[PDB]
């Protein structure tokens, strides 16, 4: 008896990257399916007995924990922000896939102006040069997709000053790729927002986007120094490390804990 | 020269907890503010060398890992949720206070309703009883006040099954608040969402209300086992262990950092 689509799609999500477990085979449908939830089950225990972190926490502060050592200031600024700061990034009407709040507001899409307020206002006080760095929610409409998510978990750091160099750039993205253990390759391309980018790719997913600056845009935010700064996906980040085919499985929802399905 | 509202509004922006600088000393309003900055400057200086971490995110860290020790799963949840759970939760048109997203989503106001959705779901596969919490935004329109914020952080803790009892309810938040050094009585008050609660009371200060279960709302959500929980503000909590005269100073903010006024 094959597998309907409504049967094969109840047994995916089911199923985990390290099962060896064949869809195809001819076995009956209910009894893959009550196997695998027993063992996602056992996996829940497992998880509740020895190790309670929320994957997406977790990364965050082991992040967290590597730019405050590298001498990186942790920012934590709103999510609900101007709508202002969507026209005045150069976002012309991206500019689709904002989620509106009320009339003046809107969920941030990116963490980078709110980063370049910070960095203009701390270069009043603190020494050259200056380094920071946000992990927290950000928000556009997708289209679905296994590499989207509407709400998704962004990490940027920058820095201003002296050091602002490609050269530098990469250096930081690599020390950081290789304390994940994930490979990657850096290609170039380009930002209606930012101009040319670096991207950061693994295989043929993107899990950032870097700029070298000075750009014209600095001028509208009081920024007139270089700079240099890199934007992550943490759920792609979650989504290699893991194996996941979906990155659903990285993101905050009720569907899924560390990976493993809650309807069980 | 006496010192204008707009005046001694800067200084008071400028002026820390720890300070002792009175401003109706008759100093020059430029003399005060100049030094004012200086000393702001410094204090930005000394955590950039020695204390990097963000207030807020640090109390983030340091819950989570007090209730992960004390056997509770750590959830990260959906802050843009269903229009459809504000109803749910019997919140009648609190009705006035939510962030309307397009048509059908909101900012969620509490995190009650992800976490009772998550009870449902562990308890099919873990063992009794099931202790779950999360730490993240949450959002109200309010009257300006120095105890309220639009964009706020939450802690939610709750236990389903055994042990869900008043007497078990203040045990945790008794050892919550002296690991956090927080001083604290409980008051009973009621909730048009929840019935009568437990409020934790700093002063006139409200810390956190929390509940007793089983409740009539409980069938709506699929619940039907005992259970209690706590809800917290972390900017309250902040509030209090720094002697912030103003809840605005723990705050997602470009304005303040740590306390610290940006704005030098
Ligand atoms: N909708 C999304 N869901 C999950 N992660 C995202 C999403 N949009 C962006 N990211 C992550 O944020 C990083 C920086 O944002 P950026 O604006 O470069 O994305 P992007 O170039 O639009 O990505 P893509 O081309 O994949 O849509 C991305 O490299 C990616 O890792
Ligand atoms: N607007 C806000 N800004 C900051 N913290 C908040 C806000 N609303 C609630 N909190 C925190 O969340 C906790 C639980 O939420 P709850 O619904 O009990 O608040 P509340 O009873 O409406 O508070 P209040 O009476 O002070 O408005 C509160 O005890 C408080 O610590
Ligand atoms: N590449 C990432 C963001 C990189 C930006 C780094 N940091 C920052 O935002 O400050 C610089 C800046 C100055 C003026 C106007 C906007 C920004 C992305 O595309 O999401
Ligand atoms: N006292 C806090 C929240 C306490 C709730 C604790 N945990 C939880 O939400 O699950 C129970 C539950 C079951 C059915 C319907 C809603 C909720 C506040 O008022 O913000
Ligand atoms: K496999
Ligand atoms: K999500
Ligand atoms: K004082
Ligand atoms: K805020
Ligand atoms: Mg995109
Ligand atoms: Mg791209
Ligand atoms: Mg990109
Ligand atoms: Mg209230
Ligand atoms: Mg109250
Ligand atoms: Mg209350």
């Not at 934590?76 to 009407?93: A, F, T």
């Not at 102006?113 to 050259?128: C, E, G, I």
């Not at 930012?194 to 070298?212: K, P």
Request: hydrophobic residues 35%; glycine residues 8%.
């Amino acid at each position: 008896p094959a597998l309907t689509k409504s049967q094969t799609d109840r047994l995916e999500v089911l199923l985990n990257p390290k099962d060896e477990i064949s869809l195809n085979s001819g076995k009956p449908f209910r009894e893959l399916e009550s196997e695998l939830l027993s063992r996602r089950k056992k996996d829940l225990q497992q998880i509740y007995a020895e190790e309670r972190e929320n994957y997406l926490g977790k990364l965050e502060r082991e992040i967290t924990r590597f730019f405050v050592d590298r001498g990186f200031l942790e920012i934590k600024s709103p999510i609900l922000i101007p709508l202002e700061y969507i026209e005045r990034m150069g976002i012309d009407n991206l500019s689709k896939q904002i989620f509106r709040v009320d009339k003046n507001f809107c969920l941030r899409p990116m963490l980078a102006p709110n980063l370049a307020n910070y960095l203009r206002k701390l270069d009043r006080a603190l020494p050259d040069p200056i380094k920071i760095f946000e992990i927290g929610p950000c928000y556009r409409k997708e289209s679905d997709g296994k590499e989207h998510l509407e709400e998704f978990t962004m990490l940027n750091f920058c820095q201003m000053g002296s050091g602002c160099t490609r050269e530098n750039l990469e250096s930081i993205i690599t020390d950081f790729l290789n304390h994940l253990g994930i490979d990657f390759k850096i290609v170039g391309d380009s930002c209606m927002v930012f101009g040319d980018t670096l991207d950061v790719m693994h295989g043929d997913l993107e899990l950032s986007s870097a700029v070298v600056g000075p750009i014209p845009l600095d001028r509208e935010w009081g920024i007139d120094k270089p700079w240099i700064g890199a934007g992550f996906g943490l759920e792609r980040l979650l989504k290699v490390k893991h194996d996941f085919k979906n990155i659903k499985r990285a993101a905050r929802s009720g569907s899924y804990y560390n990976g493993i399905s809650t309807n069980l």
